[PDB]
Write a protein that binds this DNA or RNA. Structure first.
Ligand SMILES: [Mg+2]
Ligand SMILES: [Mg+2]
Lengths: 96, 48, 27, 69, 49
RNA sequence: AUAAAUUUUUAAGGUAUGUAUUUAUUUU
RNA sequence: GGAGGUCAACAUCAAGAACUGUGGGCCUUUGCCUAUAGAACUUAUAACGAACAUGGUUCUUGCCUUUUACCAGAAC
């Protein structure tokens, strides 16, 4: 589901934005994803981030008709230097 | 334009725009994404 | 060549708007 | 001391005063210019506007039938 | 480029200018059944003619 | 056989607030 | 009298592709037709500036506890 992934990216960005304005800043350089993702122990918030991903973007026009299949990705959230981050969906076995 | 003429009028010394020409032309190829994105900003300001 | 893939704009959408070709699916 | 008012302020009280001369923004000139005009189916047991108001309206009852739920 | 909300590949991007494109009837005219995909129609065409 | 990159900051919203602090003698 | 001025004042600078004056004829001064003269400056990938800022109001968004301050598109 496209729009849900869309909402994930938004929502999570919005929360991090909360902690950010909690000080005063949206500046990205101040908050490298360490800050938000290190487990509580190491002194991070430990928030479990499945925003990141890359989000299948293919050519809406026809995707109102055919189901054209993924041709492209749109960067969900970002970094500055990247690394990556593991996302929940990958640690949960699917129902089937 | 500046050159081929040989007769013309003066201009307020801050109107001569030395870097406009660079960012109208293409970015070339080698430059790292930093500068390219700098170009696109300079256009967007121009077109507007 | 924005071909219809991508966004109306990343102003509200929290992403950077970056779009890249998908290596996987071609045939 | 919270009281319902019984009155309003005469503009005249203002009118006597001397001016100030502060300059607002919305007074800066704009529009300086005027413009002038020239078998099976038998089995079952059951054998064969605008009302001036709100809370009695049909819309409002739809609405309250959605949201407050 | 702006007014159509398109982007020349090296180009400046702007806002929609006619933002609501999303209204659409489900209507047979330009449908797929009845169209031939032979050459893709990149943007630059749409900015060129 | 891909070259597609959003942001970035300042004020406002134990205590505020209020009160008195006349010294140097105005004619019988 | 000539040349000049980092001198001044007073006019004029965006439109039927477009200026002004004058003569003759008609309606009755405007105006219309015709004849005639002169036309600086600015214009066709359109314009006084082979340049480029801010503000107001009204809408659509984005930041999103609220007002300044703002995000990016439009109209006046
Ligand atoms: Mg208070
Ligand atoms: Mg208040």
């Amino acid at each position: 589901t496209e729009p849900l992934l869309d909402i994930l990216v938004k929502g999570e960005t919005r929360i991090q934005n909360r902690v950010k304005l909690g000080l005063n800043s949206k500046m990205p350089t101040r908050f490298p994803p360490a800050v938000f993702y290190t487990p509580k122990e190491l002194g991070g918030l430990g928030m479990i981030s499945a925003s990141h991903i890359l989000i299948p973007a293919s050519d809406l026009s026809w995707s109102k008709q055919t189901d054209t299949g993924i041709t492209h990705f749109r960067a969900g959230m970002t970094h500055e230097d990247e690394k990556l981050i593991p996302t929940i969906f990958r640690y949960i076995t699917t129902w089937e | 334009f500046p050159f081929n003429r040989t007769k013309g009028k003066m201009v307020r010394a801050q109107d001569v725009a030395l870097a406009k020409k660079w960012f109208l032309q293409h970015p070339d190829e080698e430059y790292p994404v930093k500068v390219k994105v700098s170009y696109q900003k300079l256009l967007k300001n121009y077109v507007l | 060549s924005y071909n219809g893939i991508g966004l109306k704009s990343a102003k509200g959408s929290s992403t950077s708007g970056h779009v890249q070709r998908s290596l996987a699916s071609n045939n | 001391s919270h009281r319902p008012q019984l009155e309003a302020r005469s503009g005249a009280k203002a009118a006597a005063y001397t001016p100030t001369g502060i300059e607002h923004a919305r007074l800066l000139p704009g529009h300086t210019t005027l413009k002038y005009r020239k078998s099976w189916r038998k089995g079952t047991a059951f054998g064969r506007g605008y009302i001036n108001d709100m809370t009695k309206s049909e819309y409002h009852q739809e609405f309250l039938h959605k949201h407050v739920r | 480029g702006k007014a159509l909300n398109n982007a020349i590949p090296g180009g400046p991007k702007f806002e929609p200018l006619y933002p609501r494109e999303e209204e659409e009837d489900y209507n047979e005219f330009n449908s797929i059944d009845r169209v031939i995909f032979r050459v893709p129609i990149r943007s630059e065409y749409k900015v060129a003619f």
